[PDB]
Amino acid sequence: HMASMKKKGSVVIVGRINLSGDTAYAQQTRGEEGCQETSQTGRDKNQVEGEVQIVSTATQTFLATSINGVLWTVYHGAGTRTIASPKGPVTQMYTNVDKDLVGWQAPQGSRSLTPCTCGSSDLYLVTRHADVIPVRRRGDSRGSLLSPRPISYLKGSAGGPLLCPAGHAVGIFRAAVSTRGVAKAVDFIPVESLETTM
């Protein structure tokens, strides 16, 4: 019974959302078979680039965002999992189920978003398809969608950033306020909460 008992896989970086051009676009960097292998070994020799990663477990694909040298994502996606890296699986540096937040040391080669300092309530949610969706900040951790969307559209984008007009980080997207499967607002983890965790 115990020999049959295996550990859960690592989170695996399988792509990125490229935001450093004049265009936003998703890039896949690992296909399904590579992802499965890498989840088991915890050894990812790909060179990571950029700020927003697309990540997968065996059951979910979602996003992760580097801010202040830490790659952050949602606990409801990653749980307590290690992340695959060049030298093997990396244990989380931060874990907080109550905030729905986890983080690992940012991968070598990655870059971090700068926390927002401009005070803007005009926000932009970056999805896993590299859609840039306007969100009006309404409070510490909430913003309204200018256009309603099905919740299914936003599924898989938790862990991604809310950006201010200058492209600086305001928070990490985690959940949508929905009625009858239609999202009208988003819930996010503010960057100030990440700094408190650190």
Partner: peptide, 7 residues
């Protein structure tokens, strides 16, 4: 009924 749905 509004609810917060994890994404």
């Amino acid at each position: 009924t509004e609810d917060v749905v994890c994404c």
